[PDB]
Amino acid sequence: YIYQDSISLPWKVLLVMLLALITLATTLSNAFVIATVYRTRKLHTPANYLIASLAVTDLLVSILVMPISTMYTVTGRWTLGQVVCDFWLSSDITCCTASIWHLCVIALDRYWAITDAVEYSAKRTPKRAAVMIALVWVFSISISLPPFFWRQASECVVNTDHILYTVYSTVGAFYFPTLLLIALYGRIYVEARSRIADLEDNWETLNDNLKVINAAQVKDALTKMRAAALDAQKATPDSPEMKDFRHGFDILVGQIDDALKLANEGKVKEAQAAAEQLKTTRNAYIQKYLLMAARERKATKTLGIILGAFIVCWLPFFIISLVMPIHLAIFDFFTWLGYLNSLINPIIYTMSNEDFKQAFHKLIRFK
Amino acid sequence: YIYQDSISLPWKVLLVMLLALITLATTLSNAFVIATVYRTRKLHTPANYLIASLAVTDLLVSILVMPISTMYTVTGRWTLGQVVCDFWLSSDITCCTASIWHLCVIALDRYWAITDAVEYSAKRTPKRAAVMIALVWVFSISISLPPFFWRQASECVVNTDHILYTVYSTVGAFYFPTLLLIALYGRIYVEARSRIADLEDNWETLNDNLKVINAAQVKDALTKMRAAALDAQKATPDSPEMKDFRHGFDILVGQIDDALKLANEGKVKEAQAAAEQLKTTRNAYIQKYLLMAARERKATKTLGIILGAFIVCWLPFFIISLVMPIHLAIFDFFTWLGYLNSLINPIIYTMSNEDFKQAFHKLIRFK
Ligand SMILES: CN1C[C@H](C(=O)N[C@]2(C)O[C@@]3(O)[C@@H]4CCCN4C(=O)[C@H](Cc4ccccc4)N3C2=O)C[C@@H]2c3cccc4[nH]cc(c34)C[C@H]21
Ligand SMILES: CN1C[C@H](C(=O)N[C@]2(C)O[C@@]3(O)[C@@H]4CCCN4C(=O)[C@H](Cc4ccccc4)N3C2=O)C[C@@H]2c3cccc4[nH]cc(c34)C[C@H]21
Numbered sequence: 001y002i003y004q005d006s007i008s009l010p011w012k013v014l015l016v017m018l019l020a021l022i023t024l025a026t027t028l029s030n031a032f033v034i035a036t037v038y039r040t041r042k043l044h045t046p047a048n049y050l051i052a053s054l055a056v057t058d059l060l061v062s063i064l065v066m067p068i069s070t071m072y073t074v075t076g077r078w079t080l081g082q083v084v085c086d087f088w089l090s091s092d093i094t095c096c097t098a099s100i101w102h103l104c105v106i107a108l109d110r111y112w113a114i115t116d117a118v119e120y121s122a123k124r125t126p127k128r129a130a131v132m133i134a135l136v137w138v139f140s141i142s143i144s145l146p147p148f149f150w151r152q153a154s155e156c157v158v159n160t161d162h163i164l165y166t167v168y169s170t171v172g173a174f175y176f177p178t179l180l181l182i183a184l185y186g187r188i189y190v191e192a193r194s195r196i197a198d199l200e201d202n203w204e205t206l207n208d209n210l211k212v213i214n215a216a217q218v219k220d221a222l223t224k225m226r227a228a229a230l231d232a233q234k235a236t237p238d239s240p241e242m243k244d245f246r247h248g249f250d251i252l253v254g255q256i257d258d259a260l261k262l263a264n265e266g267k268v269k270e271a272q273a274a275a276e277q278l279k280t281t282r283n284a285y286i287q288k289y290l291l292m293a294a295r296e297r298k299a300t301k302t303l304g305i306i307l308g309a310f311i312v313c314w315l316p317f318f319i320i321s322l323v324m325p326i327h328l329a330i331f332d333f334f335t336w337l338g339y340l341n342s343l344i345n346p347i348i349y350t351m352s353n354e355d356f357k358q359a360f361h362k363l364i365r366f367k
Numbered sequence: 368y369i370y371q372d373s374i375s376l377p378w379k380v381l382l383v384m385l386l387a388l389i390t391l392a393t394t395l396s397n398a399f400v401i402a403t404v405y406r407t408r409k410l411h412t413p414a415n416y417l418i419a420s421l422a423v424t425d426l427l428v429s430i431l432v433m434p435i436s437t438m439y440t441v442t443g444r445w446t447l448g449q450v451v452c453d454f455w456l457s458s459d460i461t462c463c464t465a466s467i468w469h470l471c472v473i474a475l476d477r478y479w480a481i482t483d484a485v486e487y488s489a490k491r492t493p494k495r496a497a498v499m500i501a502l503v504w505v506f507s508i509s510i511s512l513p514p515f516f517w518r519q520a521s522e523c524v525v526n527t528d529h530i531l532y533t534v535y536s537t538v539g540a541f542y543f544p545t546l547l548l549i550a551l552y553g554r555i556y557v558e559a560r561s562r563i564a565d566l567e568d569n570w571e572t573l574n575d576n577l578k579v580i581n582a583a584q585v586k587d588a589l590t591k592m593r594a595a596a597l598d599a600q601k602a603t604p605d606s607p608e609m610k611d612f613r614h615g616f617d618i619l620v621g622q623i624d625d626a627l628k629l630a631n632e633g634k635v636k637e638a639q640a641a642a643e644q645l646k647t648t649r650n651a652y653i654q655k656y657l658l659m660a661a662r663e664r665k666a667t668k669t670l671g672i673i674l675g676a677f678i679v680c681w682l683p684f685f686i687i688s689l690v691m692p693i694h695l696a697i698f699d700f701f702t703w704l705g706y707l708n709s710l711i712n713p714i715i716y717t718m719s720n721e722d723f724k725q726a727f728h729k730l731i732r733f734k
Contacts, residue, residue: 187692
């Protein structure tokens with residue numbers, strides 16, 4: 001029995017439009033992300049090549065899997081033969097696993113950048129990403145290939161005969177990637193909260209007291225700026241390159257010390273001018289590392305949203321497909337919930353990553 | 368800083384005795400299980416060879432890992448050099464992973480027996496188990512071997528440098544095996560509750576009404592026995608071998624029909640004798656399949672307990688070692704909680720499996 005055979009004509013048509021609309025939006029939305037990295041010179045970074053490859057897999061889901069899936073989800077009956085059934089089931093498994101595994105490659109790349117910015121820079125080559133993408137495609141194709149034990153050839157479903165493969169395929173495609181991301185993103189969230197916020201918070205406090213400039217109240221603000229500079233200095237096993245970050249603050253501390261010398265003497269005009277002097281000369285050594293932090297905070301926020309979107313979309317499906325061996329609409333809804341992640345990913349990047357956001361404003365011609 | 372350096376002399380000694388006591392109990396308790404399968408002729412089954420191999424791995428943990436671990440847990444300092452450190456860490460990882468993977472092999476074997484008793488019998492050869500044990504040892508040794516990236520050589524700990532291996536090792540050794548067991552045991556529990564209890568419950572009801580044999584009350588008991596026989600018949604895609612199980616009940620139903628013919632006529636002595644006649648002749652065709660169910664119910668109860676013991680012992684440790692990348696006593700306690708599973712497994716088999724329970728009563732000379 002097919003539950004779809006009891007659905008009314010308006011609901012079946014409404015569902016055909018809805019599904020075709022999200023398939024086309026997935027095609028167009030990914031096509032844009034791919035085009036943007038290709039078109040934009042600034043975006044020719046190994047990091048953006050991973051975003052583009054993630055968008056290629058999601059474009060392949062929208063072309064090879066989703067349109068032919070609207071036909072099957074609404075009617076409930078396979079009508080394209082065994083050869084197209086086998087190619088579609090395999091292309092479903094490879095593309096959806098590769099989309100998930102691209103996330104981990106994007107999250108390992110982020111992890112190594114936030115964990116070893118100095119050493120990782122030389123290693124993070126576009127040639128390295130090429131191997132990581134190829135490895136992801138190799139691992140994904142190698143998942144749909146073993147369930148070809150069909151020594152037999154209406155309905156098109158993946159072979160559930162061998163329990164051990166059903167669970168291995170569920171591990172390699174989801175549970176291994178998500179446990180990796182907990183461990184990976186957890187570290188990223190600890191680094192973004194304890195360091196990419198300690199530099200930014202202690203700088204806010206420094207600029208807030210600079211904006212203040214009675215002479216008595218200036219002395220209390222100048223000693224508040226000194227404390228924030230020392231707590232901002234500790235953000236940053238030899239010390240090369242980080243000595244430059246550490247120097248700017250040590251100078252700002254010395255400049256605050258020389259300014260307070262004029263403030264303690266009683267001079268107000270000589271001290272107020274000494275504060276606006278280090279204002280430009282601080283934002284000459286510090287704004288370099290400070291701007292870096294905004295880019296870090298930004299890139300981890302989008303990843304956080306991407307990972308949240310990934311868990312919400314793919315956890316129900318993989319929880320159900322593991323429970324399945326132990327209603328059909330629930331399964332049809334969750335496959336499309338997983339398919340929806342291919343549409344959610346490009347919109348997250350276009351709304352959170354300002355390179356793609358600016359890029360989008362350019363094609364719609366919005367200022 | 369070592370937390371152990373602040374522990375008092377009586378507590379350190381008390382902890383040395385406690386740990387040596389559980390190490391020796393693990394050695395002796397596994398040695399017995401191994402000996403029992405080796406000594407007993409009846410126990411020369413591929414199923415019992417898995418119990419014995421599971422006991423070999425747990426004996427290897429008690430010899431190669433646990434005694435040298437009491438020294439380290441109580442003192443908190445490694446004092447046996449780098450060569451013994453590397454062999455001990457590797458032998459820890461291989462043996463503990465193999466013990467866990469033996470569980471899945473024991474649970475796949477149970478799953479295939481309860482899911483395909485007829486076809487699986489011919490496949491379940493001791494030669495098949497030899498490959499499954501070798502595959503488990505091959506996979507386990509292959510886990511401790513990659514963390515040999517130590518291009519460097521007080522403290523003896525596993526290399527945590529490469530995050531991707533830490534999580535892969537955590538997946539291959541625990542999360543993949545436990546998700547497999549949920550899927551495997553879930554099926555076993557569904558088969559044991561819906562079938563190995565439907566035969567047993569409908570037989571209780573049949574024997575309860577036979578124990579009854581006023582003539583009016585006999586007719587209500589005889590028609591209650593008929594209903595239970597038809598519901599017991601449905602326990603059991605061609606029908607060979609299962610036609611023999613189905614026949615016994617169909618005859619019992621016919622024998623109840625012939626008995627009720629004497630009961631409806633008004634005859635009490637002719638009908639009461641007809642019930643005690645099918646009592647022996649039923650327990651000639653049915654007690655064969657009925658005894659099989661007790662053995663099935665028994666074997667799934669021990670597995671349930673083993674799996675429960677496995678989750679309680681190994682989940683905290685593997686949850687912590689995945690959290691670790693994102694106090695040292697917590698880690699020392701949970702390793703020993705995992706080590707304890709090597710002692711819990713042989714006592715579960717000796718108290719739940721009646722072959723080992725009888726075997727134990729023989730060495731202590733108890734009747
Ligand atoms: C979202 N995708 C849907 C694919 C799917 O479920 N296909 C079928 C045709 O749709 C079903 O869900 C339908 C819905 C109504 C009844 N259905 C089914 O019973 C099965 C369930 C099933 C799920 C997984 C594997 C085998 C069967 N289904 C199928 O086999 C399955 C597909 C998949 C299988 C194995 C590993 C994988 N990695 C990544 C993926 C993936 C993508 C994933
Ligand atoms: C119970 N076993 C204990 C082993 C262990 O934890 N060894 C060390 C020496 O003890 C520690 O737990 C101690 C306790 C006090 C501080 N310790 C540590 O920080 C680490 C933690 C650690 C755990 C896993 C991997 C690497 C480090 N530890 C170690 O490396 C680790 C060991 C293990 C690692 C990887 C895969 C594995 N499969 C099966 C196992 C296994 C068995 C498992």
